[PDB]
Scaffold this active site. Sequence first.
Site, PDB file in Angstrom:
ATOM      1  N   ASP A 203      36.929 -20.232 -26.395  1.00  0.00           N
ATOM      2  CA  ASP A 203      37.641 -20.578 -27.652  1.00  0.00           C
ATOM      3  C   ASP A 203      37.654 -22.086 -27.858  1.00  0.00           C
ATOM      4  O   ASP A 203      38.628 -22.660 -28.329  1.00  0.00           O
ATOM      5  CB  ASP A 203      39.078 -20.006 -27.601  1.00  0.00           C
ATOM      6  CG  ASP A 203      39.719 -19.836 -28.966  1.00  0.00           C
ATOM      7  OD1 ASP A 203      39.004 -19.796 -29.989  1.00  0.00           O
ATOM      8  OD2 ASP A 203      40.971 -19.701 -29.002  1.00  0.00           O
TER       9      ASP A 203
ATOM     10  N   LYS B 236      37.174 -25.419 -29.728  1.00  0.00           N
ATOM     11  CA  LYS B 236      37.191 -25.840 -31.136  1.00  0.00           C
ATOM     12  C   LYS B 236      38.177 -26.992 -31.230  1.00  0.00           C
ATOM     13  O   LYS B 236      39.007 -27.149 -30.325  1.00  0.00           O
ATOM     14  CB  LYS B 236      37.582 -24.695 -32.064  1.00  0.00           C
ATOM     15  CG  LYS B 236      38.916 -24.031 -31.712  1.00  0.00           C
ATOM     16  CD  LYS B 236      39.212 -22.906 -32.676  1.00  0.00           C
ATOM     17  CE  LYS B 236      40.526 -22.243 -32.364  1.00  0.00           C
ATOM     18  NZ  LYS B 236      40.917 -21.362 -33.493  1.00  0.00           N
TER      19      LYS B 236
ATOM     20  N   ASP C 220      44.688 -23.812 -24.579  1.00  0.00           N
ATOM     21  CA  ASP C 220      44.528 -22.450 -25.072  1.00  0.00           C
ATOM     22  C   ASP C 220      43.492 -21.639 -24.314  1.00  0.00           C
ATOM     23  O   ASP C 220      42.368 -21.417 -24.764  1.00  0.00           O
ATOM     24  CB  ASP C 220      44.266 -22.386 -26.567  1.00  0.00           C
ATOM     25  CG  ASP C 220      44.490 -21.006 -27.112  1.00  0.00           C
ATOM     26  OD1 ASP C 220      44.663 -20.071 -26.281  1.00  0.00           O
ATOM     27  OD2 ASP C 220      44.501 -20.863 -28.358  1.00  0.00           O
TER      28      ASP C 220
ATOM     29  N   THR D 170      36.920 -17.751 -33.022  1.00  0.00           N
ATOM     30  CA  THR D 170      36.936 -18.168 -34.425  1.00  0.00           C
ATOM     31  C   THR D 170      35.500 -18.221 -34.949  1.00  0.00           C
ATOM     32  O   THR D 170      34.665 -18.897 -34.344  1.00  0.00           O
ATOM     33  CB  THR D 170      37.627 -19.545 -34.556  1.00  0.00           C
ATOM     34  OG1 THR D 170      39.016 -19.378 -34.239  1.00  0.00           O
ATOM     35  CG2 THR D 170      37.506 -20.113 -35.946  1.00  0.00           C
TER      36      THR D 170
END
Length: 281
Positions: free
Chosen positions: A138, A140, A160, A179
Amino acid sequence: TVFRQENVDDYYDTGEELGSGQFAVVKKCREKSTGLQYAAKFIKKRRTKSSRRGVSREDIEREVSILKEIQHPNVITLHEVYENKTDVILILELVAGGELFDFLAEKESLTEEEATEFLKQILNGVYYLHSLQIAHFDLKPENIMLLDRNVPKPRIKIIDFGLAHKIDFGNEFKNIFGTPEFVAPEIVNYEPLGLEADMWSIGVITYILLSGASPFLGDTKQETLANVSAVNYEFEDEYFSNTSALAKDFIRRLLVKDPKKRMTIQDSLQHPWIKPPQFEK
Ligand SMILES: [Cl-]
């Protein structure tokens, strides 16, 4: 695995909210016994075995055990874990300078050196994780936070770990999907996933750092995902005219559909530019 079941309010006071997601809210907090400040991440538990709401205990325990392993300047440090009937509460290192996402929005346009200063830290953090066979899955700008946003070269930490997995067999085949703008083609295509997916995401981040534009973003999630799978991106001259050819080379070697042909984290560190849920409702 069982966590501390005393009321977290007996040990901490909470303040400002720092993040709010689907089934996780983060509040700044202060430990009563030490006066030290942390970020308390409240993860909603599932209320029934067959439910789609909340996070499964298996997924919560995975995040916690990965966080317990890690200690590196460019990743957050997990302090302790509480739980009650409704939530698991992760007391995490406070990273006070905000998300890289907001820094980029408020500042706009990073010079090539500013981009490389951020990127080198992200690469160092991912090198540590990948050395441990941990895929983040994840990466980003919203999952990178600055320690202090008011210095010329802000220091960062990766946050995260909600989708992170240990990759002890080279790949994992689970329900893993981040995402749309940042996921690799193998995620879009529901194929086995490994450390290579993170390298693709680093390519997307690099493109955004240098240009302020997202390489695969369409007007809908399905169009973004279709663009990712087709590797439908290009370097727009309006945004990349003063960007070096070597920076473009770096990106090009990360945004490669075949995971076996993509640069690894070690390749990225030796590259000449550097070397010294998914549905619309
Ligand atoms: Cl987090």
